[PDB]
Amino acid sequence: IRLSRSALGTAERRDSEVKPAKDLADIWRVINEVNTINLPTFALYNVERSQPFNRNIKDNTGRREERFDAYSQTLGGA
Amino acid sequence: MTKQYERKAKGGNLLSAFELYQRNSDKAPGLGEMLVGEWFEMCRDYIQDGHVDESGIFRPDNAFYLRRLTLKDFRRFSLLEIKLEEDLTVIIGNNGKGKTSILYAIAKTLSWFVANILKEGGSGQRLSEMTDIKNDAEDRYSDVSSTFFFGKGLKSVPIRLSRSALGTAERRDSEVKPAKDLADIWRVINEVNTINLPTFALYNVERSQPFNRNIKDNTGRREERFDAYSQTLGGAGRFDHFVEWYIYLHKRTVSDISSSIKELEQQVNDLQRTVDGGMVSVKSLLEQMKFKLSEAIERNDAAVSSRVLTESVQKSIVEKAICSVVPSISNIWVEMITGSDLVKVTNDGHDVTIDQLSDGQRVFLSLVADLARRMVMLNPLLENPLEGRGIVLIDEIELHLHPKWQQEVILNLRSAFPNIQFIITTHSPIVLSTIEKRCIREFEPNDDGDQSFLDSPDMQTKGSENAQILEQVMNVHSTPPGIAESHWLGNFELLLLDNSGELDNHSQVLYDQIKAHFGIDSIELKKADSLIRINKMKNKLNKIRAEKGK
Amino acid sequence: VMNVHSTPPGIAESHWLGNFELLLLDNSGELDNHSQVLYDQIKAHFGIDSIELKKADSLIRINKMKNKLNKIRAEKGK
Ligand SMILES: Nc1ncnc2c1ncn2[C@@H]1O[C@H](COP(=O)(O)OP(=O)(O)O)[C@@H](O)[C@H]1O
């Protein structure tokens, strides 16, 4: 998988080659929906962690109980 | 009534002189101008007197700093009393030992000073209900005590911040009256005639903001002298405010007033002659700029009457403060890229912007830049505004800093800001290696808050080895205890000591695996070889002694 | 690995052991006025139980008896 970007004000724009990642994640998602499987975990813990306080707002964001809530803001840094 | 006040004021007291000035302020003026001004030019001199030492650093005659702090039932501390150094105090300990709580309490105490400096009879921050009162405390209340020092005239100004818990008979009240008195002195002396005010800054863990490229346009609030007190004791410094102020300085340096006031005068001269004959319609709706001319005349005398430094001079001072403290930064300036003005720096010979800066460099840059801006804005009467009074609290001074940078983070800060009392907390022994032993307050590993005083370490940390400071001061083994390979040298030493000294199979296999793991010329192998050498020589000496006689 | 000194280089007290090495090896390995002054400074700053003073006194002991043995050997080598 290759991520590519061109600078501002450039006539020629470079594209990204992200198809194999889509294929692998499609395999994971389709197999999981047909029959439950174990899904990989992708997390990023950058400097944006260590923020003060906890449970700032009620955070109406999508029912933490459901399984695919584990991928929400998983690579945000905090 | 006034005889004792007159006698005491000549002896070196400002509070009595302040009371005399306040009491004679509302009396009959003119005939009593000399007597009321004599107290003014004794209270103002107390805050303004100072000499330049042999090192070329302005040393105030009367320094302002906090002497001792007492915490009673405040969080994990049942009763803790702390004595603080005049220049630099370092608080060290394990996690959850209350180091952050001490800085938080000092910031809350300084909040009242800041508030009463800003507004007449202002109210500072006061303790929390939910999290500040000690749990399982039989009194359900807490208080913090401060004993600031402002020269021989004010040897002690006790400050008490107190609070009760959720549900009590008597609500404990504060004793912020001396802080109000001192800040009232500062404010009214400044308002009668501009003086230098102390800077109180708190830098918490929450100073690692990722920075925003979008900054609000300069409305004018970032150039007021009383803007260095905005969110100063609030954790993160206002780096966006610094960026706006720096861009303002760049714009006013590249534009200046001598290239605009003369143009306004020329336009007025042309238009007035044009409207001389009549038809003043070309000036009735053009009178707005003629009145804006007088408006620009105002707010400009304040730049000459308050003895503020030139904007170019302020820019140069801030730039040289930033570059001489941050190691990677070489120079900093503003460019008009695609119209908007943005700040660029020089990191390791490259010209990245602020948003491209790493978190380690950006946080330290923001800290030093905010401190320099606040000192420059609050100290307009000094040749070097960085040599001004103040108390700055920094939590985790080594945050996001490489060990190479930790060896020079204290010396640079002390050199840039000589007259600020720094109260810091650290987790690194590399920083402690550059700090005097007298400046360190330590929490014992076996401490649940029942202790009453913070002692200095027994070993001199300044100029010491990192391993020695890790062992004696921080009680950390040089090698990791949880790694099996870290005990091989001691096991080899014991297995060679109990044996006759010859390398038997048990010692030989351990030596071989030590060689295989650490390497051919690791320190462990050299130490093992030296132990073999000394054991062989000791055996030789014992054999010689046995052969000498029976 | 970190490419960092274990002892800070910007501290004047860090080079005191090396300075003592120089001022001790200069004449024959014996103490004199400036060497004794530097030893007193090391003792007062680092302390009595500090490893710095232990290294300094071990160095003094080694050098004094090295000088004695050198004189003994030079006596018979003439
Ligand atoms: N109100 C309280 N009552 C009792 N213990 C508390 C209270 N507030 C905090 N603590 C404890 O005291 C410590 C506070 O941590 P902190 O002041 O940040 O110390 P450090 O900065 O050294 O990590 C933690 O161990 C916490 O559990």
Identify the burial level of A45 via C-beta atoms within 10 angstroms of its C-beta, where 0-12 means exposed, 13-18 middle and 19 or more buried: exposed
Beta bridge partners of B341: B336
φ, ψ of residue B204 to 5 degrees: the values are -95, -170
Residue B298 sits at φ, ψ, to 5 deg, of -70, 160
Check: CB of residue B102 under 8 Å from CB of residue B82: yes
From chain B, the residues in CB contact with A48 under 8 A are: 210
The values of phi and psi at residue B28, to 5°, are -70, 125
B359 touches chain A (CB under 8 A): yes
Three-class DSSP category at A4: coil
Nearest CA to ligand 1 atom 5: B76
Rounded CA gap, B201 and B219, in Å?
24
Task: Tell me the residue type at B535.
Answer: N
- Residue B58, strand partner residues: B52
Which residue in A47, A51, A52 is closest to B359 by CB distance? Answer: A47
B451 closest CA partner among B93, B89, B86: B93
* Cβ contact A50–B210 (<8 Å): no
Q: Could you tell me the distance, in angstroms and rounded to a whole number, from the CA of residue B482 to the centre of ligand 1?
A: 27
CA distance C62 to chain B (A): 16
C-alpha B391/C-alpha B87 separation (Å) is 9
Token digits for B112? 């009242």
Edge to edge, what strands does the sheet with B199-203 contain? B199-203, B390-395, B420-425, B88-92, B440-442
Q: In 3-state terms, what secondary structure has residue B211?
A: coil
Cβ atoms of residues B383 and B259 within 8 Å: no
Residue of B211, B202, B222, B193 whose CA lies nearest to B373: B222
Do chains B and A meet with 3 or more Cβ pairs nearer than 8 Å?
yes
Whether B41 has its CB under 8 Å from any CB of chain A: the answer is: no
Backbone angles phi, psi at B70, to 5 degrees: -125, 125
Q: What is the dihedral of CA B461, B463, B465, B469, to 10 degrees?
A: 10
Per DSSP (E only), the strands in B75-139 are 77-83, 88-92
Count of residues making up chain A: 78
**Phi, psi angles (nearest 5°) of residue B200:** -120, 110
Cα separation, B115 vs B125, in Å, equals 9
| Substitution candidate for ligand 1 out of B69, B72, B74, B76 with most atoms within 8 A of CB | B76
Contacts of B237 (CB under 8 A, 6+ apart): B201, B203, B207, B231, B366, B367, B369, B370, B371
Q: Which amino acid is at A7?
A: A
A65: which DSSP letter? T
Task: For ligand 1, say whether the CB of B252 is within 6 Å of any of its atoms.
Answer: no
Contact C11 B466 (CB under 8 A): no
Lookup: tokens for B400:
């996001």
- Residue type at B132? D
Residues of B in contact with A52 (CB under 8 A): 205-206
Angle at B461 between CA B63 and CA B386, to 5 degrees: 30
Rg (CA), chain B: 31
| A41 in B contact zone (CB under 8 Å) | no
Phi, psi for residue B332 in degrees, rounded to 5:
-140, 135
| 3-state SS assignment for residue B58 | strand
Any atom of ligand 1 within 6 Å of the Cβ of B163:
no
How large is the angle between the packed helices B311-325 and B409-416, nearest 10 degrees?
Answer: 160
Ligand 1 proximity of B130 Cβ (cutoff 6 Å): no
* B235: closest chain A residue by CA: A52
Q: What residues contact B23, with CB distance under 8 A and at least 6 apart?
A: B2
DSSP strand E in B410-514: where? 420-425, 440-442
Residue A11, Cβ density class (10 Å: 0-12 exposed, 13-18 middle, ≥19 buried)? exposed
Chains that touch A (3 or more CB pairs under 8 A): B
Residues B78, B70: Cα–Cα separation, whole Å: 10
Q: What is the dihedral of CA B255, B257, B258, B261, to 10 degrees?
A: 120
- Residues on chain A touching B208 (C-beta within 8 angstroms): 47, 50
DSSP state of A20: H
The DSSP call for residue B517 is H
A47 contacts B208? CB cut-off 8 A: yes
Atom of ligand 1 nearest to the CA of B104: 17
Type of residue found at B507:
S
B338 lines ligand 1 (CB under 6 A): no
Buried/exposed A23-38: b ≥16 CB within 10 Å, e otherwise: eeeeeeeeeeeeeeee
Per-residue HEC secondary structure of B144-195 comes to EEEEEEECCCCCCEEEEEEEECCCCCCCCCCCCHHHHHHHHHHHHHHHHCCC
Q: Is A52 on the interface with B (CB under 8 A)?
A: yes
Distance from CA of C26 to the nearest CA of B (A): 24
Tokens of B171: 């609500």
Q: How far apart are CA C62 and CA C21, in angstroms?
A: 12
Nearest to B150 by CA among B86, B231, B72: B86
Contacts of range C2-7, beta carbons closer than 8 Å, 24 or more positions apart:
C2/B402, C2/B403, C2/B404, C3/B404, C4/B403, C4/B404, C4/B407, C4/B430, C5/B407, C6/B465, C6/B466, C6/B467, C7/B433, C7/B463, C7/B464, C7/B465, C7/B466
Q: What is the torsional sign of CA B352, B358, B362, B365?
A: negative
Please name the residue ranges forming H helices in C26-50.
33-46
Question: In this structure, what token pair is assigned to residue B472?
Answer: 């004696």
Give C47-50 contacts, CB < 8 A, sequence gap 24+: C47/B458, C47/B459, C47/B460, C49/B459, C50/B459, C50/B460, C50/B464
Exposed/middle/buried for residue B424 (C-beta within 10 Å: 0-12, 13-18, 19+): buried
Instruction: Determine the residue type at B157.
Output: V
Q: B390-395 and B199-203: which strand pairing?
A: parallel
Pairing of strands B88-92, B440-442: parallel
Q: Is B98 in the pocket of ligand 1 (CB under 6 A)?
A: yes
Q: Which of B39, B86, B82, B83 is nearest to B60 (CA)?
A: B86
Chain B residues lying within 8 Å of C2, measured CB to CB = 402-404
